[PDB]
């Protein structure tokens, strides 16, 4: 029959499981101990806590849902974090590798502070690669679902440490014309404009899609040859946006192909890019939203486009621009996980309020473009 001189009431001390890799040791802490001081105590008891410069490590509270794990701040007391006996804390390197696909398509690993937001990590990336204007870039996933809120963490958006992200330049309209004199740059502009049309991010009419595909045939096959380029030849999924992949499109495409004549590969690329740049939809960020129409119960899908100068409504079928508002004439906006609303003050009667799961994306684009206009005046 013996007493334990180590015993402290469960009410007056915190008993925490400290994990380092595969090692776990249970340690007792005064609850007011600051995180910084708890790290020192950990270094005094667990040898694997000495695996580097001491200020390289901190405390991370894990959770069965990884989105809910959090880094603890060095100046906070343990009991700030509402810890209970038997909770687990990881003694963890503050910096971790983050794999980023560079603008040349290769993947580079960059150490980032794992407690920070996506904006902070972007800035660290841009600093490493000599990019001063980080506001021209963003990080996206490479899985709609690839958008990242740069004011939040990767962790809370479901991005774990294994995942490679993409550094992506934002869209800017070109100050130079489309020439034939720089074939390598021409091909880059063509591939960009073509992929945007084929993957639906640049929405176009059915007629225009078949015109683009006509130039595409000229580029890929040379001049039209009625011996070879007959019904059934084209894999239409490679020449038309998904919603236009229909057999009746091939005849339209072959007409556009024939109309190119003996046009060279370079000349067709110039024409393809010029046709894309000629459309009111070119360069616009589009979102499929659901509108409430006066005198109709079922909502109507509509394309909502955001540019550096305006918001536009675009017909989902014909891609006709139905209506355009200048960013200058928007009084305020609001977003929720289910809807997005614009208030135009006395420029019109009633708000524009639509159902969408991308409302925060839309709001951040508008705010970003407005801050740019606002920053040129001051």
Curated annotation (Swiss-Prot):
Residues 254-378 are annotated as: Interaction with LAYN. It is found in: Cell projection, Ruffle membrane; Cytoplasm, Cytoskeleton; Cell surface; Cell junction, Focal adhesion. Residues 96-377 form the FERM domain. It comes from the Eukaryota. Part of a complex composed of THSD1, PTK2/FAK1, TLN1 and VCL. Interacts with THSD1; this promotes interaction with PTK2/FAK1 and VCL. Interacts with NRAP and LAYN. Interacts with SYNM. Interacts with ITGB1; the interaction is prevented by competitive binding of ITGB1BP1. Binds with high affinity to VCL and with low affinity to integrins. Interacts with APBB1IP; this inhibits VCL binding. Interacts with PTK2/FAK1. Interacts with PIP5K1C. Interacts with F-actin. Interacts with SVEP1. Consists of an N-terminal FERM domain linked via a short unstructured region to a large flexible C-terminal rod which contains 13 amphipathic helical bundles (R1-R13). The rod begins with a five-helix bundle (R1) followed by three four-helix bundles (R2-R4). These are followed by a series of eight five-helix bundles (R5-R7 and R9-R13) in which the N- and C-termini are positioned at opposite ends of the bundle, creating a linear chain. The four-helix bundle R8 does not disrupt the chain because it is inserted into a loop in the R7 five-helix bundle. High molecular weight cytoskeletal protein concentrated at regions of cell-matrix and cell-cell contacts. Involved in connections of major cytoskeletal structures to the plasma membrane. With KANK1 co-organize the assembly of cortical microtubule stabilizing complexes (CMSCs) positioned to control microtubule-actin crosstalk at focal adhesions (FAs) rims. This is Talin-1. The chain holds residues 1 to 404 of 2541 of the full protein.
């Amino acid at each position: 029959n013996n007493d334990n001189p180590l015993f402290k009431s469960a009410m007056v001390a915190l008993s925490l499981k400290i994990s380092i890799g595969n090692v776990v040791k249970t340690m007792q802490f005064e609850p007011s101990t600051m995180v910084y001081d708890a790290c020192r105590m950990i270094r005094e008891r667990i040898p694997e806590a000495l695996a580097g410069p001491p200020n390289d490590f901190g405390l991370f509270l894990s959770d069965d849902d990884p989105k809910k794990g959090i880094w603890l701040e060095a100046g906070k007391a343990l009991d700030y974090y509402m810890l209970r006996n038997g909770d687990t804390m990881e003694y963890r390197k503050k910096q971790r590798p983050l794999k980023i696909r560079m603008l040349d398509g290769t993947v580079k690993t960059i150490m980032v502070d794992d407690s920070k937001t996506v904006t902070d990590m972007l800035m660290t990336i841009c600093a490493r690669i000599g990019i001063t204007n980080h506001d021209e870039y963003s990080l996206v996933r490479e899985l709609e679902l690839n958008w990242l809120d740069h004011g939040r963490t990767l962790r809370e958006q479901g991005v774990e440490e294994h995942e490679t992200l993409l550094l992506r330049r934002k869209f800017f309209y070109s100050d130079q014309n489309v020439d034939s004199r720089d074939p390598v740059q021409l091909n880059l502009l063509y591939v960009q404009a073509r992929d945007d049309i084929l993957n639906g991010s640049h929405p176009v009419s059915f007629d225009k899609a078949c015109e683009f595909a006509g130039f595409q045939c000229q580029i890929q096959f040379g001049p039209h040859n009625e011996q070879k380029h007959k019904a059934g030849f084209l894999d239409l999924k490679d020449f038309l946006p998904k919603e236009y992949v229909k057999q009746k499109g091939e005849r339209k495409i072959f007409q556009a192909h024939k109309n190119c004549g003996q046009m060279s590969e370079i000349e067709a690329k110039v024409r393809y890019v010029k046709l894309a740049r000629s459309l009111k939809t070119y360069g616009v960020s589009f979102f499929l939203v659901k509108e409430k129409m006066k005198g109709k119960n079922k909502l109507v899908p509509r394309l909502l486009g955001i540019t550096k100068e305006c918001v536009m409504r675009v017909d989902e079928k014909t891609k006709e621009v139905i209506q355009e508002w200048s960013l200058t004439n928007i009084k305020r906006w609001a977003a929720s996980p289910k809807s997005f609303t614009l208030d135009f003050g006395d420029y019109q009667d009633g708000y524009y309020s639509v159902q969408t799961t991308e409302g925060e994306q839309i709001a951040q684009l508008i705010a970003g473009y407005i801050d740019i206009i606002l920053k040129k005046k001051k």
